[PDB]
Amino acid sequence: GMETLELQGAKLRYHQVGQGPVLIFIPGANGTGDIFLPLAEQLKDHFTVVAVDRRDYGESELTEPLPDSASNPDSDYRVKRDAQDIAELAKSLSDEPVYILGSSSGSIVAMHVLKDYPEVVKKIAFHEPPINTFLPDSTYWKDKNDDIVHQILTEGLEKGMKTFGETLNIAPIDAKMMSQPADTEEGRIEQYKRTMFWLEFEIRQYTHSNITLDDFTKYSDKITLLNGTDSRGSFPQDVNFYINKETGIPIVDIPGGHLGYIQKPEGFADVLLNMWG
Amino acid sequence: GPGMETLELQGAKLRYHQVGQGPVLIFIPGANGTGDIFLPLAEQLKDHFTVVAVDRRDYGESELTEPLPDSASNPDSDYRVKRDAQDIAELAKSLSDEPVYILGSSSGSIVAMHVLKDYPEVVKKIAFHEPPINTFLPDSTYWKDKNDDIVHQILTEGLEKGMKTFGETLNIAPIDAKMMSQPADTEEGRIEQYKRTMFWLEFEIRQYTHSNITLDDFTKYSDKITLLNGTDSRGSFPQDVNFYINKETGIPIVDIPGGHLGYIQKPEGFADVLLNMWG
Ligand SMILES: *[B@@](*)([O])C1=[C]C(O[C])=[C]C(O[C])=[C]1
Numbered sequence A: 001g002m003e004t005l006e007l008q009g010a011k012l013r014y015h016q017v018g019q020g021p022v023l024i025f026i027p028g029a030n031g032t033g034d035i036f037l038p039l040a041e042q043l044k045d046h047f048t049v050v051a052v053d054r055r056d057y058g059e060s061e062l063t064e065p066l067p068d069s070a071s072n073p074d075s076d077y078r079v080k081r082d083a084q085d086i087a088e089l090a091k092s093l094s095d096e097p098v099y100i101l102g103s104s105s106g107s108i109v110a111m112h113v114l115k116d117y118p119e120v121v122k123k124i125a126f127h128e129p130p131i132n133t134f135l136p137d138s139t140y141w142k143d144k145n146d147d148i149v150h151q152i153l154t155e156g157l158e159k160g161m162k163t164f165g166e167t168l169n170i171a172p173i174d175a176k177m178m179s180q181p182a183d184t185e186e187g188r189i190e191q192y193k194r195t196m197f198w199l200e201f202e203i204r205q206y207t208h209s210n211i212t213l214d215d216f217t218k219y220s221d222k223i224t225l226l227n228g229t230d231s232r233g234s235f236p237q238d239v240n241f242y243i244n245k246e247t248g249i250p251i252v253d254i255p256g257g258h259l260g261y262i263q264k265p266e267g268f269a270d271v272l273l274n275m276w277g
Numbered sequence B: 001g002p003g004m005e006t007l008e009l010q011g012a013k014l015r016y017h018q019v020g021q022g023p024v025l026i027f028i029p030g031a032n033g034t035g036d037i038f039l040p041l042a043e044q045l046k047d048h049f050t051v052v053a054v055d056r057r058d059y060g061e062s063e064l065t066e067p068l069p070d071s072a073s074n075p076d077s078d079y080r081v082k083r084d085a086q087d088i089a090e091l092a093k094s095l096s097d098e099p100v101y102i103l104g105s106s107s108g109s110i111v112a113m114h115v116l117k118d119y120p121e122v123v124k125k126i127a128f129h130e131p132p133i134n135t136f137l138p139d140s141t142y143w144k145d146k147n148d149d150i151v152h153q154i155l156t157e158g159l160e161k162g163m164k165t166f167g168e169t170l171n172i173a174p175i176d177a178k179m180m181s182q183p184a185d186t187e188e189g190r191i192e193q194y195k196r197t198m199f200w201l202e203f204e205i206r207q208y209t210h211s212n213i214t215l216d217d218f219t220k221y222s223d224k225i226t227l228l229n230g231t232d233s234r235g236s237f238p239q240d241v242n243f244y245i246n247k248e249t250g251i252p253i254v255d256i257p258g259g260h261l262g263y264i265q266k267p268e269g270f271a272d273v274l275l276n277m278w279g
């Protein structure tokens, strides 16, 4: 039901209703044009109302991925790309400059449109802009946005793994190693994205996978289970126990913890050479 | 990676370390997802195995060449573990005509279980180091409920309280706060509302509110610019932003019914204002 304007790296989807001069609404944190539709039906007799889903939201869809660096606080890409999106939208719909209204961060997009592509702006309206760069109290509001984001992303995650570990009864040796941050601010944020991906896309899907004891017994001569000598009492040690109890597959003990192949690689290797040839 | 190999498979580019001579031994990483963690171990076995340590396709130096399917966020989707499992089977066949040695740790051992289930033709021997799979356990319900709970807790607890105090800092208006306190009417909407909000916090608010705009950039085009303040969002931080602009540039402010979300809270008074501005 939506219109489409295929751009570089995205199909931009937008509503279009009414008739008369083009007026483009840019959404804020909502990111989608549907929020403007009850306003649009009130305006359609006077303007060709265009309410855009910005490329990263809603019915829009990127066709190549975001640069990994878009994750970075002072990244430039998304906001310039969104502004250029609006410029191409206007140009595609109207030979003449159009009206534009942006709300909240969407009016920041509107500021970049009027900066980079003034030729498509006939009038522009900034509904309650939250930008702080030119404020005289700019560092205050920058630091605060920076701090609330750090707090929301990390603080919830750090407490959760801490209690999760004791629900699993994780050996101190692993828990020591697992929490030590990286030695690089880049190593630490790939480390956050890592654990965050793991929580959402791996642990539930993998630990409730369709594997039965039956499809272990088929190949019992090939399998060894392997328990850490530093991680006894932990949840994965019980899974191995249960498997061996019901199938007979043997449990070879091996130095280290859940991470023993990096904790005690030498002794880890010696056990593997023993079992295998 | 800086010394890594590549196997180009359906959907991704699989990067992996290779060291040593002899029988092929493939190591599958767990939660860290990358094979670099096996390298000191590999140095021990390099005289006896061709050690292959894998960056699984979503991690490290491997790269997807297709989008992850939408349904991979479902907690019951088979997709990722099957794809990893077959990523391994093709890696074996690409490296050896013989069946190979395989070791997986933690959720990497689960991947190895799916290699054995679906492609035992490639497994000479296999080892499961500390598997956390619960499906076949008689207390499987306990452990699956623990996983589902902790994950849902981590993904939401920080967000619920952080946005409450953030709005106190912004002095967000009641009409806006009552609205953004509302949950969507289905789980798919609540989840949608949640992904949107996490994306905005990570990829939008810091970038956009500190992007390169000076008041000079307004001065050129004062004739075109109108600024809009909700009559219902008084003393919220954006109004003070518009108050500063008007103070320093002379560009005027038009009051408009509703608050931060006024165009949908009061779309008839919003519309009426706009028609008098520009019609
Ligand atoms: B291995 O990364 C692992 C250990 C564990 O208990 C200590 C649980 C896991 O999944 C829930 C994974």
Ligand SMILES: *[B@](*)([O])C1=[C]C(O[C])=[C]C(O[C])=[C]1
Pocket: A028, A029, A103, A104, A105, A130, A145, B170, B171, B172, B173, B205, B209, B236, B237, B238, B260
């Ligand atoms: B608008 O969506 C918006 C309002 C606000 O103060 C109430 C701050 C914002 O970002 C910092 C955005």
